[PDB]
Amino acid sequence: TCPFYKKIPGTGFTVDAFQYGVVEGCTAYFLTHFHSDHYAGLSKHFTFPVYCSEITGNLLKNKLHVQEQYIHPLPLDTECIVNGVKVVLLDANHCPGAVMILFYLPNGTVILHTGDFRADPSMERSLLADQKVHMLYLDTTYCSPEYTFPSQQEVIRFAINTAFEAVTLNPHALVVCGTYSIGKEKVFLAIADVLGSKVGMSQEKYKTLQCLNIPEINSLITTDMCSSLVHLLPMMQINFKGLQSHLKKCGGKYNQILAFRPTGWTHSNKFTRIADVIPQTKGNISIYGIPYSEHSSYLEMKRFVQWLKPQKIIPTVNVGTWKSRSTMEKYFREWKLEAGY
């Protein structure tokens, strides 16, 4: 059964609600982004309208085989009417195609669903500017002050510099990057660019990247592994056993692997600054875990909410324990008292 924090009161709409069968009274199903916990249940057999971004629609058609007659892509930053209700899609700064959804209800109430997002000051100059919001459905993944991590730019600078130094010292080194979904493409694209290489990958992963409207993509990626010195592998293979195995398949073209494992937050962010990060090493293989987040830090989330000044907040993550729920509610009250709304 579909939970309350996925229902839009006063409409026939749901958000990211595909795993509950036919939802009673739902005439339009919105999808914020193409991550499996959110799309769970969608397939070629789905026969109701799905509203989403153009990139999300390309992935629905090509990867899940959803029939084209049921895919309703909407442009960003544009007032659209769906089933008699004005809606707007905004960039979420999450993975490719990810959106936040603004709903202008018939009764005059205004609701923002963030989906998954990494809050940024640039969102203060979207169509949200000077817009009253009555209800905010908030991605609270990292809603506690312990959750700190660097900017995406700082993490990419570290990765580029690390890879360039390694391959300049040893021209026979291979660089490997782990992946398990869409998102975090900048990690492998930035490394390949500094090295003058295309990124090599499986046919399945190539198909996924061909759906993302990335400019000049044919110049950047390939299924010919042997022409490339930056390879993508599934995240589960980025360990000493899996990398040793991969090194054998390249036919003595390479004599060293440098691998990156993009993670979210980890506890080492408490103690170790990104510049000070060191790898796990065994012989000619080194593995770097790098904290490349596509969710708001605590500080980023607090800034966004204090600027927006919503009347009510409904968390959508960490809602399953009394302790977690209470912790988030205490921070929302602090933020409101500090800012005066």
Ligand SMILES: c1ccc(CN2CCC(n3cccc3)CC2)cc1
């Ligand atoms: C929102 C609100 C509360 C939680 C629970 N965690 C908070 C942070 C804790 N922590 C301590 C040291 C490193 C993390 C672990 C419990 C999650 C999300």
Ligand code: NI
């Ligand atoms: Ni996500």
